[PDB]
């Protein structure tokens with residue numbers, strides 16, 4: 001039994017490039033009692049990997065989740081053909097004792113892709129759900145500003161906000177994403193790379209300002225949005241992707257006088273905070289919503305484990321519409 005594994009040859013400087021990654025073919029030992037052999041089906045690439053990769057030693061395996069099928073088993077709880085969520089990192093084949101695996105929701109129908117397990121009915125969906133509903137605390141009738149709005153998390157934020165009856169202003173990096181999100185029904189969508197003035201565009205989009213800011217981007221973009229938050233506005237600090245691949249020091253922070261005078265609340269969160277019943281309910285709500293068409297899905301699928309680095313790099317550079325998935 002062989003595996004293929006993507007390792008970090010060299011720490012990234014700026015954006016990664018191909019020579020930073022190295023693929024190793026490796027032999028797995030046999031199963032011991034109570035272990036299984038997992039075959040990757042779908043693997044995710046995610047922005048957090050750009051940051052978490054800084055903690056690895058050169059030669060280490062890249063971290064990440066996958067949908068896997070059990071192909072050999074000495075574990076009764078896990079027969080062959082069982083589909084699991086697993087986090088062995090970027091590897092085609094792996095050995096588990098079963099304690100680290102997660103079976104899908106029972107009510108998971110065969111009419112949606114298994115890979116939504118890594119997207120809208122998964123971690124990025126949960127991030128959206130908790131960031132917007134608990135961190136921003138959206139009630140109904142609010143104007144929500146969301147950036148990276150065609151991406152895995154932000155696309156879900158916007159749709160959840162719409163179904164709760166909020167006005168949504170979304171920023172994206174391409175005209176293709178603009179048109180996709182308008183078709184979806186977001187109230188205002190613009191391309192932040194081409195508008196003449198971000199400030200003016202944000203003002204035209206919502207003259208009265210913003211109640212909530214679901215921030216995926218940080219940096220200068222956020223400095224500008226902060227200038228148009230309403231008094232007591234709430235910012236969920238979900239991510240800061242404009243800084244993850246940045247070469248120099250960080251950009252200037254936000255103008256303190258504005259943050260103080262507008263009495264802003266800003267809270268960062270990590271999705272893994274919500275566990276047990278709270279998490280299970282969230283997942284069932286997301287699946288429900290997808291089954292009802294209240295949340296549409298789109299995926300950006302890259303074919304072949306050997307292109308996993310390219311899939312990661314393109315997502316960080318904005319290639320993707322919807323969740324970036326690698327099909328094994």
Ligand SMILES: NC(=O)c1ccc[n+]([C@@H]2O[C@H](COP(=O)([O-])OP(=O)(O)OC[C@H]3O[C@@H](n4cnc5c(N)ncnc54)[C@H](OP(=O)(O)O)[C@@H]3O)[C@@H](O)[C@H]2O)c1
Pocket residue numbers: 046047048123124127147148149150151152153154171172173174177216217237238239240241242243269270271272315316317318319320322323324
């Ligand atoms: N628990 C947490 O707190 C948590 C969990 C998951 C994800 N996140 C964060 O959520 C954000 C979105 O994650 P995702 O998984 O849904 O990925 P994503 O939105 O599917 O993909 C990343 C998107 O980021 C945008 N982007 C990249 N560089 C940018 C820049 N300099 N300025 C503006 N936009 C830029 C690009 O879209 P554009 O074409 O629109 O530029 C790119 O498509 C990231 O900040 C991620 O770290 C946080």
Ligand SMILES: O=C(c1ccc(OCCN2CCCCC2)cc1)c1c(-c2ccc(O)cc2)sc2cc(O)ccc12
Pocket residue numbers: 047048051052055087238239270272
């Ligand atoms: O805090 C996290 C983080 C926390 C837990 C994670 O879990 C990944 C492993 N996985 C979790 C559950 C299943 C088994 C393994 C991932 C990122 C994030 C960051 C961080 C900061 C400092 C650091 O040294 C490392 C990472 S950056 C980041 C961006 C995100 O979009 C999400 C989380 C994060």
Ligand SMILES: O=C(c1ccc(OCCN2CCCCC2)cc1)c1c(-c2ccc(O)cc2)sc2cc(O)ccc12
Pocket residue numbers: 270271272273274
């Ligand atoms: O990486 C983390 C993690 C990071 C920091 C944590 O605590 C930060 C400070 N810690 C607090 C207690 C005292 C020591 C320092 C806990 C988990 C993972 C999780 C986490 C859980 C809750 C939360 O709010 C944020 C993240 S869940 C998880 C699963 C993994 O396989 C690996 C990492 C993780």
Ligand SMILES: [Cl-]
Pocket residue numbers: 065085086087100101102
């Ligand atoms: Cl897992």
